[PDB]
Scaffold this motif. Structure first.
Motif, mmCIF file in Angstrom:
data_model
loop_
_atom_site.group_PDB
_atom_site.id
_atom_site.type_symbol
_atom_site.label_atom_id
_atom_site.label_comp_id
_atom_site.label_asym_id
_atom_site.label_seq_id
_atom_site.Cartn_x
_atom_site.Cartn_y
_atom_site.Cartn_z
ATOM 1 N N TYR A 1 50.752 51.231 33.016
ATOM 2 C CA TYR A 1 49.810 51.454 34.099
ATOM 3 C C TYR A 1 50.438 51.723 35.454
ATOM 4 C CZ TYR A 1 45.919 50.371 31.045
ATOM 5 O OH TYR A 1 44.988 50.381 30.048
ATOM 6 N N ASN A 2 51.747 51.537 35.568
ATOM 7 C CA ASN A 2 52.421 51.875 36.811
ATOM 8 C C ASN A 2 52.746 53.369 36.915
ATOM 9 O OD1 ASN A 2 52.314 49.378 38.149
ATOM 10 N ND2 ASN A 2 54.066 48.606 36.978
ATOM 11 N N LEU B 1 34.572 35.152 35.779
ATOM 12 C CA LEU B 1 33.707 35.953 34.927
ATOM 13 C C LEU B 1 34.328 37.318 34.642
ATOM 14 C CD1 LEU B 1 30.287 35.220 36.528
ATOM 15 C CD2 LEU B 1 30.782 34.873 34.094
ATOM 16 N N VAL B 2 35.110 37.800 35.600
ATOM 17 C CA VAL B 2 35.895 39.027 35.446
ATOM 18 C C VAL B 2 37.348 38.713 35.791
ATOM 19 C CG1 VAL B 2 33.897 40.545 35.948
ATOM 20 C CG2 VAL B 2 35.468 39.929 37.799
ATOM 21 N N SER B 3 38.280 39.502 35.247
ATOM 22 C CA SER B 3 39.717 39.197 35.288
ATOM 23 C C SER B 3 40.362 39.367 36.643
ATOM 24 C CB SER B 3 40.491 40.075 34.300
ATOM 25 O OG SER B 3 40.504 41.434 34.696
ATOM 26 N N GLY B 4 39.747 40.182 37.490
ATOM 27 C CA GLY B 4 40.377 40.600 38.733
ATOM 28 C C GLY B 4 41.126 41.923 38.633
ATOM 29 N N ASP B 5 41.376 42.395 37.413
ATOM 30 C CA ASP B 5 41.893 43.757 37.229
ATOM 31 C C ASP B 5 40.802 44.749 37.631
ATOM 32 O OD1 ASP B 5 44.091 42.506 36.116
ATOM 33 O OD2 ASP B 5 43.804 43.289 34.086
ATOM 34 N N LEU B 6 41.223 45.907 38.141
ATOM 35 C CA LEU B 6 40.253 46.873 38.704
ATOM 36 C C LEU B 6 40.400 48.237 38.007
ATOM 37 C CD1 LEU B 6 40.730 45.875 42.467
ATOM 38 C CD2 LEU B 6 39.060 45.031 40.842
ATOM 39 N N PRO B 7 39.274 48.888 37.708
ATOM 40 C CA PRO B 7 39.325 50.070 36.847
ATOM 41 C C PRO B 7 40.002 51.259 37.494
ATOM 42 C CG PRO B 7 37.093 49.773 37.782
ATOM 43 C CD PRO B 7 37.881 48.509 38.050
ATOM 44 N N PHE C 1 42.942 44.869 31.802
ATOM 45 C CA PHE C 1 43.859 45.674 31.028
ATOM 46 C C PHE C 1 44.618 44.897 29.958
ATOM 47 C CE2 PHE C 1 43.552 47.887 35.210
ATOM 48 C CZ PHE C 1 42.961 49.050 34.741
ATOM 49 N N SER C 2 44.432 43.571 29.913
ATOM 50 C CA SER C 2 45.232 42.734 29.000
ATOM 51 C C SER C 2 45.002 43.018 27.512
ATOM 52 C CB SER C 2 44.997 41.234 29.281
ATOM 53 O OG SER C 2 43.646 40.881 28.976
ATOM 54 N N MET C 3 43.814 43.516 27.163
ATOM 55 C CA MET C 3 43.463 43.783 25.781
ATOM 56 C C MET C 3 43.730 45.256 25.501
ATOM 57 S SD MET C 3 42.557 40.867 24.392
ATOM 58 C CE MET C 3 43.952 40.254 25.303
ATOM 59 N N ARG C 4 44.740 45.482 24.672
ATOM 60 C CA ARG C 4 45.304 46.807 24.453
ATOM 61 C C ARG C 4 44.938 47.345 23.071
ATOM 62 N NH1 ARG C 4 49.310 48.549 28.306
ATOM 63 N NH2 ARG C 4 49.530 46.995 29.973
ATOM 64 N N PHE C 5 43.963 48.262 23.056
ATOM 65 C CA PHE C 5 43.431 48.850 21.820
ATOM 66 C C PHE C 5 44.046 50.216 21.461
ATOM 67 C CE2 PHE C 5 39.761 46.335 20.288
ATOM 68 C CZ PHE C 5 39.529 45.448 21.353
ATOM 69 N N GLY C 6 44.967 50.720 22.265
ATOM 70 C CA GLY C 6 45.511 52.045 22.027
ATOM 71 C C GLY C 6 46.415 52.236 20.810
ATOM 72 N N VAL D 1 32.754 44.291 38.837
ATOM 73 C CA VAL D 1 34.112 43.845 38.592
ATOM 74 C C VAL D 1 34.911 43.664 39.874
ATOM 75 C CG1 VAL D 1 34.119 44.846 36.262
ATOM 76 C CG2 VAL D 1 35.101 46.183 38.179
ATOM 77 N N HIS D 2 34.392 44.155 41.019
ATOM 78 C CA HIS D 2 35.006 43.899 42.328
ATOM 79 C C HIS D 2 34.395 42.712 43.050
ATOM 80 C CE1 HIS D 2 36.477 48.003 41.721
ATOM 81 N NE2 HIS D 2 37.358 47.769 42.675
ATOM 82 N N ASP D 3 33.345 42.112 42.478
ATOM 83 C CA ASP D 3 32.606 41.091 43.212
ATOM 84 C C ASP D 3 33.419 39.806 43.412
ATOM 85 O OD1 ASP D 3 29.948 40.024 44.279
ATOM 86 O OD2 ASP D 3 30.454 38.578 42.674
ATOM 87 N N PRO D 4 33.522 39.323 44.660
ATOM 88 C CA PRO D 4 34.376 38.151 44.916
ATOM 89 C C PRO D 4 33.914 36.886 44.175
ATOM 90 C CG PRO D 4 33.898 39.308 46.970
ATOM 91 C CD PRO D 4 33.061 39.958 45.912
ATOM 92 N N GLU D 5 32.609 36.655 44.086
ATOM 93 C CA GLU D 5 32.109 35.475 43.381
ATOM 94 C C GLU D 5 32.396 35.562 41.877
ATOM 95 O OE1 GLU D 5 28.323 35.986 45.329
ATOM 96 O OE2 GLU D 5 28.464 33.958 46.173
#
Ligand SMILES: [Cl-]
Ligand SMILES: [Cl-]
Ligand SMILES: [Cl-]
Length: 483
Positions: free
Chosen positions: A442-443, A47-53, A431-436, A37-41
């Motif tokens: 998140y701040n 393929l991944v959102s750019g959000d980081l865990p 984080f856009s998909m909120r299942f809680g 999920v950190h991969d630049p390509e």
């Protein structure tokens, strides 16, 4: 009202990679998932959102607050995992013939366990003990799952595999991973058995095979498109489950099950019932027949047979299928293939993720499993992407009612675990998909109760859908929602 057995437990499930990080000192940079999920390509390709865990909800540091809220909500059961990568952040000594296709035994003994212990991260182990002790002190029943997708990087470099290079650690394509998973599972049971009530070896192994090697637009690692390797991964995962079952049983007498991603297969028309059977065969029965009946392709392996005590059902929505010249096909515009925040082709509302509202499918899946195998079950996941909380009150009550129905029909279902207590990192969606039930800022890492959490508290504390909330056993009104 609709009442549940006195021993039935309402709870939640969550994953380590998706919930643990976000407080100081909590980052785990050592998984395939983290690299992926950190991969630049992968980011550039979308393929991944750019959000980081590592900017997540912070359960590693804030678990007491999660548990406080769960306790106040009347929850009595939790399913969590330990992250393999946290326990063994650096590689283990090599064992074992890598070229052997079948892994029929993985020996576990005291000296091997004591040697593994030398390589384990004691800070992580101790911290997990503190988390799980806190959990048990709330009177929560505990299902510990061993694996929820991320592998130690020393076992899988998913970027190397994405690039078509199979000379390195290849994840579930390598029997080394099967051997190490069995030893890891035995080790964790040896260390934690005093806290655990029941075990699961894995969560949604079919996602690893299916999204990892076929559904490659999904952004699931390693994103290498190959029917052949999808099959190899699933073969290895099946063997890994059996060896982990035997491994846990060598140190514990407690129940060991597995958790699987299910869909309810539904016929487009009255002439498509055979297509439903084929889809169930191709998506569900082949896997469970292997780990319960030992059946694989057509032989019976005695080292696989009987390696399951209970089944964890993860259910979100249906899949509509129709018969075709050669076989069947799934249809777009239903199930998980809908537009987001819209309605399906059947006029049913869809979630933030484009998943159709279909609670009857949970009854279907529970009763199908029961009639085929007669193993008891937990609903280990059920939930909806819904930041606004518009649909979730209906989604919750409706699905809980379907579990009541299943029990009434005779199926042995022992609890319902919502996905999830709080919002979390949804892999390629970020984080856009909120299942809680609980909304996360998140701040600040603050948790807020969505109204559905108050509804859940009414259910859990009463052990029933009470008269006052029975109206939520219904489809969210579609007229006021987006189409
Ligand atoms: Cl399924
Ligand atoms: Cl059976
Ligand atoms: Cl936020």
């Amino acid at each position: 009202m609709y009442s549940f057995p006195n021993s039935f437990r309402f709870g939640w499930s969550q994953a380590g990679f998706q919930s643990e990080m976000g407080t100081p000192g909590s980052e785990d940079p050592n998984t395939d998932g983290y690299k992926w999920v950190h991969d630049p390509e992968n980011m550039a390709a979308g393929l991944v959102s750019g959000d980081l865990p590592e900017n997540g909800p912070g359960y590693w540091g804030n678990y007491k607050t999660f548990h406080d809220n769960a306790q106040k909500m009347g929850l009595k059961i939790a399913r969590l995992n330990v992250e393999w990568s946290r326990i063994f952040p650096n590689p283990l000594p090599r064992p074992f013939d890598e070229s052997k296709q079948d892994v029929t035994e993985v020996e576990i003994n005291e000296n091997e366990l004591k040697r593994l212990d030398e390589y384990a991260n004691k800070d992580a182990l101790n911290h997990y003990r503190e988390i799980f002790k806190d959990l048990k002190s709330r009177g929560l029943y505990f299902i510990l799952n061993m694996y929820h997708w991320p592998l130690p990087l020393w076992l899988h470099d998913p970027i190397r595999v994405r690039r078509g290079d199979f000379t390195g650690p290849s994840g579930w394509l390598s029997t080394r991973t099967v051997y190490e998973f069995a030893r890891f599972s035995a080790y964790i049971a040896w260390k934690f058995d005093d806290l655990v009530d029941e075990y699961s070896t894995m969560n949604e192994p079919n996602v690893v095979g299916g999204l990892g090697y076929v559904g490659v637009k999904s952004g699931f690692p390693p994103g290498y498109l190959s029917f052949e390797l999808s099959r190899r991964a699933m073969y290895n995962i099946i063997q890994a489950h059996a060896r982990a079952y035997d491994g846990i049983k060598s140190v514990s007498k407690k129940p060991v099950g597995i958790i699987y991603a299910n869909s309810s297969f539904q016929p487009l028309t009255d002439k498509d019932m055979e297509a439903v059977e084929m889809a169930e065969n191709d998506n569900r029965w082949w896997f469970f027949d292997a780990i319960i009946r030992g059946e694989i392709t057509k032989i019976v392996r005695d080292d696989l047979k009987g390696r399951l005590d209970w089944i964890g059902v993860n259910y979100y929505t249906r899949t509509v299928v129709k018969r075709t010249e050669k076989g069947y096909v799934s249809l777009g515009g239903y199930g998980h293939g809908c537009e987001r925040n819209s309605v399906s082709l059947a006029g049913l509302p869809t979630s933030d993720f484009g998943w159709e509202f279909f609670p009857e499918g949970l009854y279907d899946v529970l009763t199908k499993y029961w009639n085929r195998y007669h193993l008891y079950m937990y609903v280990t996941e059920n939930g909806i992407a819904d930041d606004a909380d518009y649909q979730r009150p209906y989604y919750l009550v409706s699905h809980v009612y379907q579990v009541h129905r299943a029990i009434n029909s005779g199926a042995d279902v022992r609890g319902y675990l919502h996905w999830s207590l709080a919002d979390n990192y949804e892999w390629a969606s970020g984080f856009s998909m909120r299942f809680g039930l609980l909304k996360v800022d998140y701040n600040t890492k603050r948790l807020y109760w969505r109204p559905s959490a108050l509804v859940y508290r009414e259910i859990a504390t009463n052990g029933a859908i009470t008269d006052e909330i029975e109206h939520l056993n219904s489809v969210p009104p579609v007229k006021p929602l987006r189409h």
